[PDB]
Design an enzyme around this catalytic site. Structure first.
Site, PDB file in Angstrom:
ATOM      1  N   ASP A   1     -16.404 -35.925  35.780  1.00 20.06           N
ATOM      2  CA  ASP A   1     -16.315 -34.571  36.384  1.00 20.06           C
ATOM      3  C   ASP A   1     -16.216 -33.444  35.374  1.00 20.06           C
ATOM      4  OD1 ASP A   1     -15.624 -32.401  38.022  1.00 20.06           O
ATOM      5  OD2 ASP A   1     -14.032 -33.595  38.885  1.00 20.06           O
TER       6      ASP A   1
ATOM      7  N   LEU B   1     -21.022 -25.790  35.970  1.00 21.46           N
ATOM      8  CA  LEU B   1     -21.897 -26.953  36.216  1.00 21.46           C
ATOM      9  C   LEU B   1     -20.892 -28.057  36.583  1.00 21.46           C
ATOM     10  CD1 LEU B   1     -24.456 -26.434  33.326  1.00 21.46           C
ATOM     11  CD2 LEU B   1     -24.878 -25.842  35.631  1.00 21.46           C
ATOM     12  N   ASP B   2     -20.752 -28.511  37.794  1.00 18.31           N
ATOM     13  CA  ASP B   2     -19.776 -29.489  38.202  1.00 18.31           C
ATOM     14  C   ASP B   2     -20.352 -30.796  38.706  1.00 18.31           C
ATOM     15  OD1 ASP B   2     -17.578 -30.645  39.026  1.00 18.31           O
ATOM     16  OD2 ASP B   2     -16.821 -28.918  40.105  1.00 18.31           O
ATOM     17  N   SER B   3     -20.363 -31.842  37.923  1.00 13.26           N
ATOM     18  CA  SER B   3     -20.928 -33.134  38.245  1.00 13.26           C
ATOM     19  C   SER B   3     -20.001 -33.743  39.289  1.00 13.26           C
ATOM     20  CB  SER B   3     -21.050 -33.990  37.003  1.00 13.26           C
ATOM     21  OG  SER B   3     -19.748 -34.142  36.340  1.00 13.26           O
ATOM     22  N   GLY B   4     -18.770 -33.221  39.404  1.00  9.45           N
ATOM     23  CA  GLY B   4     -17.858 -33.801  40.364  1.00  9.45           C
ATOM     24  C   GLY B   4     -17.961 -33.141  41.715  1.00  9.45           C
TER      25      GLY B   4
END
EC number: 3.4.23.-
Lengths: 113, 115
Positions: free
Chosen positions: A37, B36-39
Site C-alpha cells: 500500500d 497514487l494508492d495501490s491500496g
C-alpha cells in the site's frame, strides 16, 4: 517483485515476520499475508495477524512493536525479497499493510515505462 | 509516469479534473493533487478538493457519494507532460487528500516493481 495494478486484485504478498528480541515467545517467526500500500507511510500488522506474546508499546489507534521485527516478503513463486528490519505498528485493521517504509526498503517504483 | 516509493514523501501527482456534464458549473476544470494508492480499490476526490457545485449523488469504512457527472481525469507528470485521459465517476468523501485508486492505476497501465 513486479505486480501489475488491477482494480479487481488487491496487491497481496506472503510475509515471514521474525521477532528478534531477547525474551521467549511461543513462535518466533510466523507467515502472514499483507497488502502493498503506497498510500501508507508505515507498515501496520493487524491485531489478528500479530502474535499475542509479541509486546507492543503505546484517525487510527495504534501501538508499535516493542521488539525489532525482521520482515521478509515472499513472492507468488516462493522466492524471497531482501529482509528488512523495523518496528511495525499494530492496529485493529482489516488486514496487514506494508507501507512505504517497506516499499522503499524493497526498492519499488510505480511505473508504465 | 514513473515514481519511486519513498517513505518520507508521499507519491503525489497533479491532476486536472474536467466536468463533461450535461449542466453548468462555475469551473469546468480544476487542478488538484492526489496520492497514487495501490491500496485503494477506487478513486476518491476529497470533499475539500471537490468543486462545490459539481453534483454528487448517494451510491449503493467512510460514507461516500458518487459524482453525478462523468469526469475526465488527466494525470500530469513532474515535467508537465500528460498521461492519456481517463473517464470515470469518482467517489467523493471526507478523506485526507484525493486518492487515485487501482481503478485509475490500471487505466494508466501501472505496475509496482523493483526490476
Amino acid at each position: 517483485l513486479a505486480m501489475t495494478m488491477e482494480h479487481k486484485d488487491r496487491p497481496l504478498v506472503r510475509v515471514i515476520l521474525t521477532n528478534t528480541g531477547s525474551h521467549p515467545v511461543k513462535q518466533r517467526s510466523v507467515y502472514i499475508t499483507a497488502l502493498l500500500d503506497s498510500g501508507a507511510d508505515i507498515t501496520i500488522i493487524s491485531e489478528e495477524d500479530w502474535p499475542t506474546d509479541w509486546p507492543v508499546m503505546e484517525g487510527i489507534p495504534m501501538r508499535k512493536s516493542r521488539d525489532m521485527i525482521e520482515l521478509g516478503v515472499i513472492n507468488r513463486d516462493g522466492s524471497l525479497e531482501r529482509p528488512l528490519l523495523l518496528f511495525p505498528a499494530v492496529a485493529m485493521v482489516r488486514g496487514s499493510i506494508l507501507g512505504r517504509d517497506c516499499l522503499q526498503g524493497l526498492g519499488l517504483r510505480l511505473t508504465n515505462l
